Design a protein around this ligand. Structure first.
Ligand code: ANP
Lengths: 553, 602, 104, 221, 181
C-alpha cells in the first residue's frame, strides 16, 4: 500500500553493489501480463545499470522450491502474478530476520481478492496494490484492528459475537470469486510516467500487456483505450511524413478486428479460425460456411480472393474493406468486430496490430521447442518461455514469425478439434454448470499446456455459449496423454456478448479448494492458477461427483 | 514514358533508400553480383509492398509494360554502382520471387491472364537452348539509312521508316547482342488436380541466367506471367513467360554440386559417422511404414550411396552401385517399400512397367514427323542416370531392351546404333528389382531358378538378390499387426517416430541431402585383407555351390557375384565417409549377402 | 585451461586415450608449463581468458541446463536451468568458456 | 613518463606487434612501471569501493568507469604478450640460432622478458623431449640434430625481413632525414630505387627497407 | 597462441582501437574519477562542449548523463563535397577522418538521437561513398606490383578488412620476382 515512487526509490537504496546486488525478479509465470511488464522493468533496471538475475518460475510449489533453494545475501526481492491469495510468510516462514529487515520483497498482480496477510502485517511486503484497490476494503481494516488484539462471562460471548461479526464479515472476504483487474503493465507505465519516462516501445509493451488479456473481458481495458489512446496522442512522432521513414516508423490506431491473424493470413481463414465468427456464425456448421460465402456474396469478393494472401489483396479491396463491412456485416450480428485499437509499424517489415502480435507470443508457450518427467516438461515450457522473451525484442523479427505461422498450426489443431467434439456432442448440461471431458484424440501433449486448454475452452465457451440463451454457465475441461493420468483440468467462465453488466467472479477457485479441502486424493495444487489442477482419472470421476455437490455457485 | 521515367526514379529510389537494418540488401546484392557477372537481382515483393504499395498496385496491374522499365533503372543502377565515369555493360536480368499464394494448374483460365501466378507443377522435358535477340541494327537495302533497334521484352516485326519500302531492312548480324531462351515444357503435379483426367502440360520459357536452372523431371516452382501467342478463333497458344523461377526443395543439386556449405552439415554428417547406430539408424530412416524385414531394409541403404566405381586405365570400368531383388510373396511391402525408395533418391524415376509410366524403358529414338530427321526421345533409364532404378512387374519387362537392361546395369551404358545416331549414352543407374516371382511360394518346392523369365543369368546380372518369405507365423505378426492399427489412425505409430526424431532417428528429407552429400566425395576403398577374406569366403561360396551341386542341381554364383559383394563394401563404407573399410566393416556386408547365398541353397 | 579454476585438463581434450601417450604426457606437461605462465603473471592473467575485447560493460547471459551454483567466488549468483542475468563483462569470461553461460 | 604516453607507446608496441613480421624487443623499461601501475589502482579502487560500503549506514559511475578502465587496459597487454609467445614458438629454433652465436644482439634481458626466456627454453626443451622420445630413437646419426643440414632447411625461419605490411608514417619533424619534395624519407630498396615517402602517405613495402623506421618510430603499421 | 587472426587485426579489435580516440560531448552532470590515461576532470560543466575519450562517452551516453556531439565532418552537405571530390578524382581517395566507418556504426547504434537527420540519409551517402571508394580500391588493385604500394588515404577498417589479400599475395609476387636472379 504505497505510491510507486517511494518503494522504487527505496529499492534503489538496496540496489547497486558488486558483486550484485542483491535483488532479483521472479517472472510469474507463463501468464503474459508479466512479460511486457518485466521487460519494461528489465529495461528500467538496465537503464539504472543494475545487475539482476532473471527467474522464469512455473509451478506454484516450484516457488517454494526456489525461495528455499538459493537466496543468500539477497537484500531485496521482486515477484509477479502470485501471492494475491496465499501468503508466503506462511508459505516460506519467515519469521523475523534482523524492523528494517535484512530483505525486501516486491510482489505484483491483478488477481483478487488479495490475501488478508497482504495489506497489513508488513514484513515481506510492501504490498503493491496501489493505487488500484484502496479499496476500501475497510473489511481488512476490521479484519485486524478489530481482530487484534482480541460481567466477564456475558462480555465473553459479546466479544466473541462482535468477533463473530468480524469473523462472518471477514469470512465473506477471502471466500469469494477470484478475478483479474488491471494489467500490471499500465501500473508500471504510470510508474515509469511518475518517474517521467515514456517510450513508444514502453507504450507498445503496455499495449501488448493490456492487450494480452483482451480475449478475457476487458474490463478496465475498455477505458484503457483512453489511458492509452491519449498517450498515443501524447506521442507525436512527426507532424507529417517524412516518408516512410525506414526508421520510426511508429504505431497508430486503425480498424482492428476480433477476426484472427488478419494481416499475415488469408482473409478467408481470417474469418474462419476466428473466435467471434465461430459461435455467432456457426463455423463447425457447413450451413454457416455457405452462409459465410453469402457474406462475400455481399462483399463482392471472390472465394479465390478469400484464399488470397493479405499482402496481395487489391488496394481497392483494402480501402473499401471497412466500408464494405459496414454495408454488410451488420446483417448477421457481426457489427461488433470493428475496433479502433493500436497497430505497431516496422514499415518495410510490415505492420502488426497489437491484438495480432499477442497470439504468436502465446504460440511459443506450448510449442517451438517418474514425476520428474513432467517437471522436466514444465521445465521445457519455461525453456521455450525465453524464446518468447526474445520474441518481444524487435531486434530479431524473424524468430517471431515462427510463432506467427505456428498460430495457424495451433488454431488448425484447435478449430478442427472443437468441431470434432461438437459433432460428437460431448456436452453435459448437468444442472449448476455445463462441463465436458476429453479422454483422447490427436496431439494431447499439445493439450498439456494450461493455455492450450485455456484458448481451447475459451474458444469453446464462446462457441458453446454466445449466448445461446439462456443463463450462461461456467465450464470445466480435462485431458490426458501421459503421466498415468495427471488429467490437466481447468475452471472457466462465460464471456458476455459485448453487452458486461457484472464482473462475475469464478467460484471454482474456492470450489476446487473445497475439493482439496475434501478427500483430496490425487488432487494436485502444484498449479499456480486456482482455475486449474492436476487430477487422477481414478479419483477425478468421484472428484466430479464431489464437484456436483456441494455446488458452491 | 516520362511517367514511366518517374516510375524509373521510383525504383532507383526503391533500391538506394530501402533498409533491413541497416544495409541495403539489394544494393549490396548488386555490387556482389556484378563481380559474379550475374547481372541480375532477386527481389522480395514483400520488401517492395513494404517500401511502397502504389508501385505494386500498378505493377500487379500490367507488369508486362513495367518489368522491363524496372530493369532499365536497375541496369542504370549498376552504372551508378559498378564504375565511375567522366563498358560494355549488359542489360540486366531480373528475377523476382515471393511467398505469394499458390494456385492450382487445372483452374487456370482467362481471368488472371496477363498477371502473376505462383505455382509449381513439374517439368517433363527440357527444350534445347534457343538464342534470341538483345540488340540489333540495320542498313537500308535502298537508302542505306542506319537503324538501331534495341529489342526488348516481352511479336514485333522490323519498322520500315527511313520506296523506300515496303520494309527494306536486314539484320546486322555481326554487331548484335544476344541471350538464350529455354522453352520449358512443364506438367502439373501428380497429385492435383487430375480428377479423372490426364495431367496437362503448360509451356513456359526461361531466358538468360534462368536457363538450364532446372533438370528435366524434377519438382519445381515457377512464378512467371500467364499470356498467349498465335503460333500456327483467334485461337492463340497459352503459355507463361518466366520470372522468376525457384527450385522446389532444394532442389539445387546440379551440378557438381551444392552445399553451400552451411557448415553444420559437415559436423552433423561426421557425427553421423561417429554414431555407431548410424548405419542402422539409416535402416530406421527407410521404413516408418514397414516394421520388420530388417535384412532387405539394410539392403536398400547401401545402394543409394553409390558403391565402388573405379575407372582404371584402360577404358575398363566397373559399375556402381549394383542391383537388388525384392521378389517374394505379395505382402512383402516391397512396392510400398519401393515407393519409399524412389522418394528417397535425389533424382530417379519410378517404373512399374513395361516402362514408366508410358516410358520406353530404354530411350526410343523417334522421328519428328515435322521436318523429318530422327531425334532421341529420352528414356526412363536415361533420365534416371546417376540415380535409382525402380522396377515392378519385372516379370513383364520389354524383352528386346530387357537386354539393354541386361547391359546398362553392367556396362553403365546403352548403345543405340539405330537410324542415324551411334552414340552410346550413359545409364549409370543402379537397379532394384521388385518383381513378383512366378506362382508366389510355388517356386520354392521347385527349382527356384528360371523363376525370372527363361534364364538364370539375370540373377548374375543382379547382385544382392533377396527372396522374401513370409509364413503366417505367430507373434512376429502380432507385434506388426499391433503396429498396424497404430499406423492408420490416429497415426499412433507416426507420432511414435517423432520422439525417435528427437531421441535418435533421421528426418529422411535429410537422407536425400546425406546421400547427395557423400556421393559427391571420391570413392571409398577397402584395405587388402578384407579382400583376401572375400577370397577365402568366396572360395568356399563357390566350393560350397559346386559341392551343393554334387546333386547335379541346376542353378546363382559368378565372378561378378564376388565383385558384387565387393561393391557392397564400398557402399556400407561410403556410409562411414571413410576412405578405408575395416575388416568387420566389410563383414556385415558379407552377412548381408549371406542370406542370398542361402537363397541359392533354397 | 579453461577457466577459473581450470581446474584440470582431465576430460578436457576428449581424445584422451586416442591421443598417443607420448603426446599425452607431453601435453599435460606443457600445460604444466603454462601454469608457470600463470605464475609469471602477476597481471592477473587470464591469458587463457580475456581473448576478445570488452563491451559494454554489461550483458545478459542465459544458463543452459547448468547447476550450480559454483559461484562461491565473488558472489553467489545461483545457477538454475533457464536462468539469465544482467551482469558486467568480468564474471562472464569463465562460465561463458566453462559452457554454463550463453547469451551475449 | 606521461602515463598517457605509456599507453600510447603500449598500443604503439601492440599494434606494431601483431602486424610485425617477427619478434621485436620487450619494452620492460616502460611496461614495468605499467605492470606495477595496474596493481596500484587495482588495490586503490577496492579501498574506495569497500569505502563505498562505509556510507551504507550514489555515484558508481566513475566507480565502474575506473573498474572498466582496468580490464580494458589489462586485456591490451594480453594479445601483445601472447602474440610474442607464439612468435617465440614459431621462431624457437632461430632464437637459439641467434642465442648460441656471440654477435650481435641476443635474448639476454634485451629481447625477451624473464618469463619469455623461461617459456622459450622450457618449451623448446619439452619439445625436444616430445620429438626425441617419439621420432628420434629411431634417430640415425646425421639426423640427430634439429637444425640446418644444410637444406632444406630448417628454421632458420623466419628471419624474413622481406615481408609486406601496411604502414603509416609519422615523426616530430625538424620542421634529420627530410629530403622533400614535401617530406621524408628514403631509402632505396634492395633491387630498386627510391620512392620515396611523406608522413601523410602510407607506403607498403618490405619490412627490411623500412625496419629502421620502426626502430626510429618514424612510421606506424 | 592466438591462432586467429593472426597477422591482421579483427574488425572487432580495430573498433577497440578507434574507441580510444578523443571527441566532444554535452554533459548532463555537473572522486575524481582518477583513472589512468584520462587527465580530466573536475566536475565537468553540464550542457557545454567538452573533450573526452570515446568509450567513456559511449558508456555515459548509455546512462544518458552525457550527449555526444556529431563530428563537424559528419553532415549531409559535407559528404556531398567529399563524394563529389571523389567522382572528379578517379585515382585519389580524397580525405577522411579515418576511423569513420567504425564511428558511423558506433554512433548510429546509440548516438543516433543526437544527430539531425542522419537517418535514411548518411547511411546511404556513406554506403555510396564506401561504394565509389570501393571500386576505386578494386580498380587500383590492377596496378598491384612488387614492391610499391600507394594506398594513400584509406581507412583502417577499409584496409584491415582486405589486409590478407594484398599482403599474402604480394609476398608471392616479390619472392618469385627477386628470386629470378
Ligand atoms: N511392414 C509391413 N509389412 C507388410 N505389409 C505391410 C507393412 N506395412 C504396411 N503393410 C501393408 O501390406 C502391404 C504391403 O505391400 P505388399 O502386400 O507386399 O504388396 P507389394 O508386394 O508391395 N506390391 P507388388 O510389388 O505388386 O507385389 C501394403 O498394401 C500395406 O497396406
Amino acid at each position: 500500500i504505497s505510491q510507486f515512487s517511494e518503494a522504487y526509490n527505496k529499492i534503489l537504496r538496496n540496489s547497486s553493489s558488486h558483486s550484485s546486488c542483491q535483488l532479483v525478479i521472479f517472472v510469474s509465470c507463463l501468464n503474459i501480463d508479466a512479460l511486457c511488464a518485466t521487460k519494461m522493468l528489465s529495461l528500467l533496471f538496465k537503464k539504472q545499470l543494475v545487475q539482476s538475475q532473471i527467474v522464469p518460475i512455473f509451478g506454484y510449489s516450484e516457488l517454494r522450491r526456489h525461495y528455499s533453494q538459493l537466496d543468500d545475501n539477497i537484500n531485496s526481492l521482486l515477484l509477479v502474478g502470485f501471492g494475491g491469495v496465499i501468503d508466503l510468510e506462511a508459505f516460506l516462514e519467515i519469521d523475523p530476520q534482523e524492523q528494517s529487515f535484512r530483505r525486501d520483497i516486491y510482489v505484483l498482480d491483478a488477481h483478487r481478492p488479495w490475501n488478508l496477510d497482504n495489506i497489513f502485517g508488513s514484513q515481506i511486503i510492501q504490498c503493491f496494490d496501489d493505487g488500484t484497490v484502496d479499496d476500501t476494503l475497510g473489511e481488512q481494516k476490521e479484519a485486524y484492528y478489530k481482530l487484534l488484539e482480541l460481567n466477564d462471562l456475558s462480555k465473553r460471548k459479546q466479544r466473541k459475537k462482535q468477533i463473530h461479526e468480524y469473523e462472518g464479515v471477514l469470512e465473506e472476504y477471502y471466500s469469494q470469486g477470484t478475478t483479474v483487474v488491471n494489467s500490471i503493465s499500465a501500473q508500471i507505465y504510470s510508474l515509469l510516467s511518475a518517474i517521467g519516462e515514456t517510450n513508444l516501445s514502453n507504450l507498445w509493451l503496455n499495449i501488448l500487456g493490456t492487450t494480452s488479456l483482451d480475449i478475457a473481458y476487458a474490463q478496465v481495458y475498455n477505458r484503457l483505450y483512453p489511458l492509452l489512446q491519449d498517450e498515443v496522442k501524447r506521442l507525436t512522432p512527426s507532424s507529417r511524413n517524412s516518408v516512410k521513414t525506414p526508421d520510426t516508423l511508429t504505431l497508430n490506431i486503425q480498424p482492428d478486428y476480433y477476426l484472427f491473424l488478419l494481416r499475415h493470413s488469408s482473409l478467408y481463414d481470417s474469418f474462419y479460425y476466428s473466435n467471434y465468427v465461430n459461435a455467432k456464425l456457426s463455423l463447425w456448421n457447413e450451413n454457416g460456411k455457405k452462409r459465410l460465402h453469402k457474406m462475400f456474396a455481399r462483399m463482392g469478393i471472390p472465394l479465390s480472393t478469400a484464399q488470397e494472401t493479405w499482402l496481395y489483396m487489391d488496394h481497392s479491396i483494402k480501402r473499401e474493406l471497412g466500408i464494405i463491412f459496414d454495408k454488410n456485416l451488420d446483417r448477421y450480428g457481426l457489427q461488433d468486430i470493428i475496433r479502433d485499437g493500436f497497430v505497431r509499424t516496422l514499415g518495410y517489415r510490415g505492420s502488426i496490430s497489437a491484438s495480432e502480435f499477442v497470439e504468436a507470443l502465446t504460440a511459443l508457450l506450448e510449442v517451438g521447442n517418474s514425476a520428474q518427467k513432467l517437471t522436466n516438461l514444465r521445465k521445457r515450457w519455461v525453456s521455450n518461455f525465453w524464446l518468447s522473451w526474445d520474441a518481444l525484442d524487435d531486434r530479431k523479427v524473424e524468430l517471431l514469425n515462427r510463432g506467427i505461422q505456428l498460430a495457424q498450426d495451433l488454431q488448425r489443431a484447435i478449430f478442427n478439434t472443437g468441431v470434432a467434439i461438437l459433432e460428437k456432442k460431448l456436452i453435459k448440461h448437468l444442472r449448476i454448470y455445463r462441463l465436458c471431458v476429453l479422454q483422447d484424440g490427436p496431439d494431447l501433449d499439445l493439450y498439456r499446456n494450461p493455455l492450450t486448454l485455456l484458448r481451447l475452452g475459451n474458444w469453446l465457451i464462446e462457441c458453446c455459449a454466445e449466448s445461446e440463451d439462456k443463463q450462461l454457465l461456467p465450464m470445466v475441461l480435462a485431458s490426458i496423454d501421459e503421466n498415468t493420468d495427471t488429467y490437466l483440468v481447468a475452471g472457466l467462465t462465460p464471456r458476455y456478448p459485448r453487452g458486461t453488466k457484472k464482473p462475475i467472479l469464478n467460484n471454482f477457485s474456492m470450489a476446487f479448494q473445497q475439493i482439496t479441502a475434501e478427500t483430496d486424493a490425487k488432487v494436485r495444487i502444484d498449479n499456480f492458477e486456482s482455475s486449474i489442477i492436476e487430477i487422477r482419472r481414478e479419483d477425478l470421476s468421484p472428484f466430479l461427483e464431489k464437484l456436483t455437490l456441494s455446488g458452491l455457485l | 514514358d516520362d511517367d514511366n521515367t518517374e516510375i524509373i526514379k521510383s525504383f532507383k529510389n526503391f533500391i538506394l533508400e530501402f533498409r533491413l537494418d541497416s544495409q541495403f540488401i539489394y544494393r549490396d546484392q548488386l555490387r556482389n553480383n556484378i563481380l559474379v557477372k550475374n547481372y541480375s537481382l532477386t527481389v522480395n515483393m514483400e520488401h517492395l509492398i513494404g517500401y511502397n504499395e502504389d508501385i505494386y498496385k500498378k505493377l500487379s496491374d500490367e507488369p508486362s509494360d513495367i518489368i522491363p522499365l524496372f530493369e532499365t533503372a536497375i541496369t542504370q543502377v549498376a552504372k551508378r554502382i559498378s564504375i565511375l565515369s567522366r563498358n560494355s555493360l549488359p542489360t540486366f536480368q531480373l528475377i523476382l520471387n515471393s511467398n505469394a499464394n499458390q494456385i492450382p494448374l487445372r483452374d487456370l483460365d482467362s481471368e488472371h491472364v496477363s498477371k502473376i501466378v505462383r505455382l509449381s507443377g513439374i517439368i517433363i522435358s527440357t527444350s534445347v537452348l534457343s538464342s534470341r535477340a538483345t540488340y540489333l541494327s540495320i542498313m537500308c537495302r535502298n537508302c542505306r539509312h542506319t537503324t538501331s533497334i534495341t529489342i526488348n521484352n516481352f511479336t514485333v516485326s522490323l519498322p520500315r521508316s527511313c520506296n523506300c519500302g515496303p520494309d527494306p531492312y536486314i539484320i546486322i548480324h555481326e554487331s548484335s547482342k544476344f541471350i538464350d531462351q529455354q522453352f520449358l515444357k512443364l506438367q502439373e503435379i501428380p497429385e492435383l488436380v487430375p480428377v479423372g483426367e490426364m495431367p496437362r502440360n503448360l509451356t513456359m520459357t526461361c531466358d538468360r541466367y534462368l536457363t538450364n536452372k532446372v533438370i528435366p523431371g524434377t519438382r519445381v516452382t515457377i512464378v512467371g506471367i500467364y499470356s498467349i501467342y498465335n503460333s500456327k478463333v483467334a485461337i492463340r497458344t497459352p503459355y507463361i513467360k518466366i520470372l522468376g523461377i525457384q527450385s522446389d526443395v532444394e532442389t539445387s543439386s546440379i551440378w557438381n554440386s551444392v552445399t553451400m556449405f552451411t557448415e553444420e552439415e559437415e559436423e552433423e554428417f561426421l557425427q553421423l559417422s561417429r554414431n555407431p547406430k548410424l548405419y542402422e539408424i539409416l535402416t530406421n530412416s527407410i521404413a516408418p511404414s514397414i516394421f520388420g524385414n530388417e535384412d532387405i531394409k539394410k539392403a536398400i541403404v547401401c545402394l543409394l550411396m553409390g558403391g565402388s566405381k573405379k575407372i582404371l586405365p584402360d577404358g575398363m570400368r566397373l559399375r556402381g552401385d549394383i542391383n537388388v531383388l525384392l521378389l517374394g510373396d505379395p505382402g512383402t511391402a516391397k512396392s510400398q517399400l519401393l515407393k519409399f525408395v524412389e522418394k528417397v533418391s535425389p533424382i530417379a524415376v519410378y517404373t512399374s512397367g513395361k516402362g514408366s509410366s508410358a516410358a520406353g524403358l530404354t530411350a526410343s529414338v523417334q522421328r519428328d514427323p515435322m521436318t523429318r530427321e530422327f531425334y532421341l526421345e529420352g528414356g526412363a533409364m536415361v533420365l534416371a542416370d546417376g540415380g535409382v532404378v525402380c522396377i515392378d512387374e519385372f516379370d513383364k519387362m520389354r524383352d528386346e531392351d530387357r537386354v539393354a537392361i541386361h547391359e546398362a546395369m553392367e556396362q553403365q551404358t546403352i548403345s543405340i546404333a539405330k537410324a542415324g545416331i551411334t552414340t552410346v549414352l550413359n545409364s549409370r543407374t543402379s537397379v532394384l528389382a521388385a518383381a513378383n516371382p512366378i506362382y508366389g511360394r510355388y517356386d520354392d518346392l521347385k527349382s527356384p531358378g528360371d523363376n525370372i523369365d527363361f534364364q538364370t543369368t539375370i540373377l548374375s546380372r543382379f547382385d544382392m538378390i533377396f527372396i522374401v518369405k513370409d509364413d503366417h507365423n505367430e507373434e512376429r505378426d502380432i507385434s506388426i499387426a499391433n503396429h498396424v492399427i497404430n499406423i492408420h489412425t490416429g497415426n499412433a505409430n507416426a507420432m511414435q517416430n517423432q520422439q525417435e526424431e528427437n531421441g535418435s532417428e533421421i528426418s529422411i528429407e535429410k537422407m536425400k541431402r546425406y546421400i547427395t552429400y557423400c556421393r559427391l566425395k571420391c570413392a571409398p576403398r577397402l584395405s587388402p585383407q578384407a579382400a583376401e577374406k572375400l577370397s577365402s569366403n568366396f572360395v568356399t561360396i563357390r566350393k560350397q555351390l559346386l559341392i551343393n551341386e554334387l546333386e547335379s542341381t541346376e542353378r546363382p554364383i559368378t565372378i561378378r557375384q564376388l565383385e558384387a559383394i565387393i561393391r557392397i563394401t564400398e557402399s556400407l563404407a561410403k556410409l562411414e565417409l571413410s576412405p578405408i573399410a575395416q575388416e568387420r566393416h566389410v563383414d556385415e556386408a558379407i552377412r548381408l549377402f549371406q542370406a542370398s547365398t542361402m537363397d541359392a541353397a533354397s | 585451461n579453461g577457466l577459473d579454476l581450470m581446474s584440470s585438463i582431465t576430460f578436457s581434450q576428449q581424445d584422451t586415450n586416442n591421443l598417443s601417450h607420448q603426446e599425452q604426457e607431453y601435453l599435460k606437461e606443457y600445460c604444466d608449463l603454462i601454469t608457470d605462465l600463470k605464475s609469471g603473471d602477476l597481471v592477473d592473467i587470464d591469458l587463457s581468458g580475456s581473448l576478445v575485447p570488452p563491451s559494454d560493460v554489461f550483458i545478459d547471459v542465459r544458463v543452459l541446463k547448468d547447476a550450480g551454483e559454483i559461484q562461491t567466488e565473488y558472489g553467489v549468483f545461483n545457477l538454475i536451468k533457464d536462468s539469465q542475468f544482467f551482469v558486467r563483462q568480468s564474471d562472464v569470461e569463465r562460465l561463458i568458456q566453462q559452457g554454463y553461460l550463453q547469451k551475449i | 613518463v606521461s602515463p598517457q604516453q605509456d599507453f600510447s607507446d603500449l598500443m604503439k608496441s601492440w599494434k606494431n606487434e601483431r602486424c610485425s613480421p617477427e619478434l621485436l624487443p620487450y619494452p620492460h623499461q616502460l611496461m614495468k612501471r605499467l605492470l606495477n601501475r595496474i596493481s596500484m589502482q587495482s588495490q586503490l579502487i577496492e579501498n574506495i569501493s569497500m569505502g563505498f560500503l562505509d556510507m551504507q549506514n550514489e555515484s558508481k559511475l566513475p566507480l565502474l568507469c575506473m573498474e572498466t578502465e582496468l580490464e580494458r587496459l589489462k586485456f591490451v597487454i594480453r594479445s601483445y604478450i601472447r602474440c610474442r609467445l607464439s612468435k617465440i614458438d614459431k621462431f624457437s629454433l632461430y632464437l637459439r640460432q641467434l642465442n648460441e652465436d656471440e654477435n650481435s644482439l641476443i635474448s639476454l634481458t634485451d629481447l625477451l622478458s624473464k618469463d619469455e626466456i623461461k617459456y622459450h627454453d622450457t618449451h623448446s626443451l619439452i619439445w625436444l623431449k616430445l620429438v626425441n622420445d617419439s621420432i628420434l630413437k629411431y634417430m640415425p646419426e646425421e639426423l640427430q640434430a634439429i637444425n640446418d643440414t644444410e637444406g632444406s632447411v630448417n628454421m632458420i625461419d623466419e628471419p624474413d625481413w622481406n615481408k609486406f605490411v601496411f604502414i603509416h608514417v609519422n615523426g616530430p619533424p625538424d620542421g634529420e632525414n627530410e629530403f622533400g619534395k614535401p617530406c621524408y624519407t628514403v631509402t632505396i630498396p634492395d633491387l630498386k630505387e627510391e620512392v620515396e615517402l611523406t608522413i601523410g602517405s602510407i607506403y607498403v613495402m618490405r619490412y627490411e627497407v623500412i625496419r629502421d623506421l620502426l626502430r626510429d618510430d618514424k612510421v606506424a603499421l | 597462441l592466438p591462432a586467429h587472426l593472426q597477422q591482421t587485426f579483427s574488425p572487432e579489435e580495430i573498433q577497440f582501437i578507434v574507441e580510444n580516440e578523443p571527441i566532444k560531448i554535452f554533459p548532463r552532470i555537473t572522486w575524481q574519477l582518477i583513472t589512468t590515461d584520462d587527465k580530466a576532470l573536475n566536475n565537468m560543466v553540464a550542457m557545454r562542449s567538452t573533450e573526452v575519450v570515446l568509450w567513456i562517452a559511449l558508456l555515459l551516453k548509455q546512462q544518458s548523463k552525457c550527449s555526444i556531439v556529431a563530428p563537424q565532418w559528419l553532415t549531409t552537405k559535407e559528404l556531398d563535397r567529399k563524394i563529389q571530390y571523389e567522382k572528379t578524382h578517379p585515382d585519389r581517395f580524397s580525405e577522411l577522418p579515418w576511423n569513420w566507418l567504425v564511428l558511423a556504426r558506433i554512433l548510429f547504434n546509440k548516438a543516433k538521437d543526437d544527430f539531425h537527420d542522419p537517418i535514411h540519409e548518411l547511411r546511404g551517402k556513406i554506403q555510396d561513398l564506401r561504394e565509389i571508394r570501393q571500386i576505386k580500391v578494386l580498380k587500383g588493385l590492377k596496378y598491384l606490383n612488387e614492391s610499391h604500394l600507394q594506398l594513400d588515404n584509406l581507412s583502417l577498417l577499409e584496409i584491415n578488412e582486405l589486409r590478407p589479400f594484398i599482403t599474402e599475395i604480394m609476398d608471392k609476387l616479390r619472392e618469385i620476382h627477386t628470386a629470378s636472379l
